[PDB]
Chain A
Amino acid sequence: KMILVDKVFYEKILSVESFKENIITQSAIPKISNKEVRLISSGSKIFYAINNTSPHSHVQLRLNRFFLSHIPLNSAAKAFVRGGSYLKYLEPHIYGSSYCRLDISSFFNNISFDDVKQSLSPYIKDEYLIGTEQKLIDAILNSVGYESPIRKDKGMIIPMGFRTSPAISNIVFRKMDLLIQDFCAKKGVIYSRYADDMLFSNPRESKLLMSDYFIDEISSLLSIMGFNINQSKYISREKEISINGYVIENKGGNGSIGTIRLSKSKLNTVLKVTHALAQNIPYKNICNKYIKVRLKEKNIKYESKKDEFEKKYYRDQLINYLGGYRSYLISLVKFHSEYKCVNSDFIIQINGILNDIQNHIQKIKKNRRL
């Protein structure tokens, strides 16, 4: 059964108490004002963060929990979906002999709010929420949307960092997921997508992924809803590709299965951290030099104790990092054990690295008590 949110659904399950006053007084639910949104700057990107105290944050979180998670998606979208992962995004391409990787320029900034309304309309009842002033769908879009004060020209914009932006992006892009999947499959190409990053692989022996025709066709398909291809990130290669560190390799021809491993670039930081821990260089230097984690003096919670606090914090950061990298590598190991697509020698290297990490973690936890 397709999900359908109506006025009673919004009043009881979604609004709860966040917008009780606005729903009893028959006053229109207002836009997310600039007061509730802070603007962080990360490189050339700008991130929008809403305050938790605002009711908009609560309604957005509950919207993610109860409504957006029920709308069906396309199987080629391996990002922000229940059970999806990067390894699942790379896996279907082990059978391919040639690889192509494309990117979408400003995926979240180019999502038109009109497309969002058209996508979410069939799953929301066409009722009037507040008298004959505001519609239910418009109120929900008020919950999910925003106007960037930096760029007032576009008006409604879906910003990165919100509660609901990734899932809404997936739902609005399901249309292009279907179109590109149909095109690639009729061409015999395996297609998958993680956020804005699209990966195609041709298992046959052909130059299709290397020609300009393929890029032209994907750009033509993306142009329907106004997207563009980032030409700086376009990659095409044969028999192996090194996608952001993850290396896929398939030398064979008919009926060959490739292998997914990790390049030395990915292992560089963890190997250096293990070597430094074996070298007995202090935890502060390890955290600062390689991990870029530090305890700023303004972030000291209490002035009762400082040196012991800093030692405990650095130990906590190191234990957390080692646990996290171990978790990442066992994610790789489980992916191998369930799909059987990771290089065997790389599996041996992973096992050795894991044993070293566990020995270092045991040494750290033992030195904690001394």
Chain B
Amino acid sequence: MTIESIRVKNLLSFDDVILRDFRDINCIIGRNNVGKSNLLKVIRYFYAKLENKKVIPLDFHTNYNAVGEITFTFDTTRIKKIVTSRKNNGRFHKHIYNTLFKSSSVKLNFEELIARKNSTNKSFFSLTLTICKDDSVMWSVDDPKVRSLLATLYPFLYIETRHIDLYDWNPIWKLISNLNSFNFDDVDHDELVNFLDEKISSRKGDYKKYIDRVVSVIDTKPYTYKEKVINYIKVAIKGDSFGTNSNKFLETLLHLLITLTRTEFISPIVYIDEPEVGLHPKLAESFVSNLNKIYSKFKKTSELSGPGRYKTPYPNIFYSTHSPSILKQTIKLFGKDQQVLHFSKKKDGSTRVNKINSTYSDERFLNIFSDNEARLFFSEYIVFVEGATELELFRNLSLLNLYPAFSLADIYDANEVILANINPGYSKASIPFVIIKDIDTLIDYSIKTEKFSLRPLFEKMIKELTKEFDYYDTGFGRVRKEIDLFSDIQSSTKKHMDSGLFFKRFSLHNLSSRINKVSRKLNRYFMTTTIEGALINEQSLPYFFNWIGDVILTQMTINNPNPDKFIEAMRRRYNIKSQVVPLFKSVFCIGLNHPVYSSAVDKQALRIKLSFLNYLKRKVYSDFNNEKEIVLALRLAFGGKTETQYTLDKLRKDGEAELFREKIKNYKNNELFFLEPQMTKTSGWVTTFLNYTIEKITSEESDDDRIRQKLSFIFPEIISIIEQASSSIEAEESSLTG
């Protein structure tokens, strides 16, 4: 490595911040300038004070402390390996030993020196800069030679892309002339001038006479060594000159650094500010791809070996980005060699830095990694879900219009493996999230045996929550009692009614409440019923019926190019009363396009529609004994589950509820034939349902608080989830912005 740690105490927006475990690529994300620019300012100030530049001291986070400290730990293991060896008796190695490693090995005895040599040791050098209240600066190492040498060995290069200069390439030369160590001091500039003017002269002297005349005319400063080397290099190069222009500038910068550092022991640290600014997304992805290609082409491992491959450590690259494309490409290409840093705000307003897990052991997840997955890294609050219906509901524009707080939460569907290797808890990240799952993932009910059985994920949750089996006593006893009740859930048997459709005495709502209360500390919320079960509730049945009326009255058209003769012929052939179902089947059909019909045809269609609506209401209220049976039938017909958590396919395979299944089949094949294509889970009936419902209630009432109250009454559970999420969002927003 190059830098082991950076620690800032009581400076700018930092209270006490320690950054370590630096990888080869460090991606910095978060809310803008909540400490990003402050960290950059801290690093720049430390490296400016390292080279004895007169720069203004930084401000204190709170004036109730006398000083602020910046501690840099350099990893000098490789340099110790470089110099302690006998072969390299050069002047530079000798000076490096006398400066950095002496006064720390002198104190040691022979045994400890041997132990340090022989062991697989790591050597560190800690330098602390302290700013007092009266602007004075104190170093923990009082030798300026140490500071200058540390500045040389670990140079800091800052590249800003917004204010980049596409025609000023001076940093390129200042970088290349320094990186590769050519000793032109031994080559006299007097000898070099005589040498070059000996050669390039057309006549030996003619060029020299011209240059001597110029020099006698022009009053020039003596050449500095860096100027000499820059002249050398860019004269020998076959070219001095060189949105996409900034990309090329940055890409050549990184290529030069990575290529040139392979032969040197100097390991620079490069910080890039918004590399993607002014870049097409494909251009940013290609920039990261080119950087990775340069990185891996020069990489030597146990497999890749040969001339042209080195084991020299690579420079440490920080870059602060705001685009998911850069982050996605980094994560995909760099694997285990990158780190993602998240910047947020504490309670007292100070900056908080976290490391988000971006390394995945599942290669499939790395390959399928796309823009949507990389977007979650910028999320303020995540609502992980399980199916597409949840995404359809929680993303509904009309619903989120009435709840602006929930508009800041990103809803993402996560599989069990995806959730296992993405979730913030395992990533120890401070991006708050909630995992919304159904209660069926823990307990499965058997009608034949009338018994609940426990799912493995419930056992895993119990094992995670039973951490008190290895510890002492405190106020956690109620949790143990709840876990005991969860254990007793297994042995209990419960009787069913109507061949396994309803529970005699048991309320799954109470068990769901207990599970949610217990597991809220694990950030998982368990909804009592499915989303399609939550929308189809007893309170919203009128509006649901209204919706059906709408899809009959407005979304239906006539299946004939000649409405008049068609409607007359099927009025004649099929009776309005005794044959309403086939008449409606032949006459009406669902169609996006609504051709204009005649007044008589429109009146006849309206009359048939009203008659069919009355018939359907009568038959719905007649065939089903109670409203609960109606709700259950509608839920199953759309793919839902009963109070016993059984799907229509599950019942068909098992063979229970034959009468209810046949009734639903009769309704779908006779009365609800038009709504059959919308019976599927992916039909998008949720969006139309919610849009019509919210528009209708807005027509009913004109107050925003009142409309929220009505929506809460209609969908108690979905609105409860939304309100809990919004309250948590506001709490964590006060945790960040408050």
Q: A: which residues have CB within 8 A of B? A: 72-76, 95, 174, 178, 181-182, 185-186, 188, 203-205, 251-257, 316, 319-320, 322-324, 326-327, 338-340, 358, 361, 365
Contacts and interface: CB of A to CB of B under 8 A. Distances in A.
Interface string B4-48: 010001100000101010000000000000000000000000000
Interface of B: 5, 9-10, 16, 18, 20, 62, 64-67, 71, 73, 100, 103-104, 106-108, 112, 124-128, 130, 132-133, 136, 138, 140-143, 146, 469-473
A21 to B, nearest CB: 32
A233 B377 CA distance: 53
A72 B133 contact: no
Given A75-B65, A255-B141, 19 more contacts: A74-B64, A75-B16, A76-B65, A95-B140, A174-B64, A181-B66, A185-B130, A186-B136, A251-B108, A253-B106, A253-B107, A254-B141, A255-B127, A257-B73, A257-B126, A319-B472, A339-B18, A340-B5, A340-B20
Contacts of B9: 75
A327 B140 contact: no
A76 B65 CA distance: 8
Contacts of B132: 182, 185-186
Nearest to A174: B64
A255 B126 contact: yes
A218 B261 CA distance: 51
Nearest to B130: A185
B140 A203 contact: yes
Given A75-B9, A186-B136, A254 B64 contact: no
A251 B107 CA distance: 7
A323 B64 CA distance: 38
B62 A72 contact: yes
Q: Shortest 10 CB-CB distances between A and B: which pairs?
A: A323-B472, A255-B125, A182-B66, A253-B103, A181-B66, A252-B104, A320-B472, A185-B67, A323-B471, A75-B65
Given A74-B65, A319-B472, A323-B472, A204 B140 contact: yes
A91 to B, nearest CB: 11
B615 to A, nearest CB: 64
Nearest to A73: B64
A204 B142 CA distance: 8
Contacts of A327: 471-472
Contacts of A361: 470
A257 B141 CA distance: 13
Nearest to A76: B65
A253 to B, nearest CB: 4
Contacts of A255: 100, 104, 124-127, 140-141, 146
A14 to B, nearest CB: 22
Contacts of A323: 470-472
Nearest to A204: B142
A251 B471 CA distance: 38
A355 B73 CA distance: 33
A181 B67 contact: yes
8 contacts: A181-B66, A185-B132, A203-B128, A254-B125, A255-B141, A257-B126, A320-B472, A327-B472
Contact of A358 (B62, B64, B71, B470): B470
A178 B142 contact: no
Nearest to B140: A203
Contact of B473 (A74, A76, A182, A316): A316
B126 A181 contact: no
Nearest to A181: B66
B98 to A, nearest CB: 12
Contacts of A252: 104, 107
- The residue among A76, A188, A338 with the most chain B CB atoms within 10 A of its own CB is A188
A254 B471 contact: no
Contacts of A320: 472-473
A186 B130 CA distance: 9
Nearest to B4: A340
Nearest to A182: B66
A144 to B, nearest CB: 21
Given A72-B62, A74-B65, A182 B133 contact: yes
Nearest to B146: A254
Most B CB contacts (10 A, CB to CB) among A255, A320, A327, A339 go to A255
Residue of A95, A254, A365 with most partner-chain B CB within 10 A: A254
A153 B499 CA distance: 86
A256 B104 contact: yes
A124 to B, nearest CB: 18
Contacts of B140: 95, 188, 203-204, 255
Contacts of B65: 74-76, 178, 181
B66 A254 contact: no
Contact of B143 (A76, A254, A256, A324): A254
Nearest to B125: A255
B138 A188 contact: yes
A252 B107 CA distance: 7
Contact of A75 (B10, B142, B470): B10
A75 B104 CA distance: 31
Contacts of B62: 72
Given A174-B64, A256-B126, A320-B472, A185 B138 contact: yes
Nearest to A255: B125
A145 B66 CA distance: 30
Tell which of A174, A185, A320 has the most Cβ of chain B within 10 Å.
A185
Contacts of A182: 66-67, 132-133
B66 A178 contact: yes
Contacts of B146: 254-255
B66 A185 contact: yes
A254 B104 contact: yes
A348 B9 CA distance: 31
A369 B62 CA distance: 56
Nearest to B64: A72
A218 to B, nearest CB: 15
A203 B140 CA distance: 7
B479 to A, nearest CB: 16
A254 B473 contact: no
Contacts of A340: 5, 20
Contacts of B133: 182
B128 A95 contact: yes
Contacts of B71: 95
Nearest to B133: A182
A324 B104 CA distance: 39
A174 to B, nearest CB: 7
Contacts of A326: 471
A319 B474 CA distance: 12
B126 A324 contact: no
Nearest to B21: A340
Nearest to B61: A75
A74 B15 CA distance: 12
A338 B470 CA distance: 24
B91 to A, nearest CB: 21
A182 B63 CA distance: 12
Contacts of A251: 107-108, 112
Nearest to A324: B472
B271 to A, nearest CB: 23
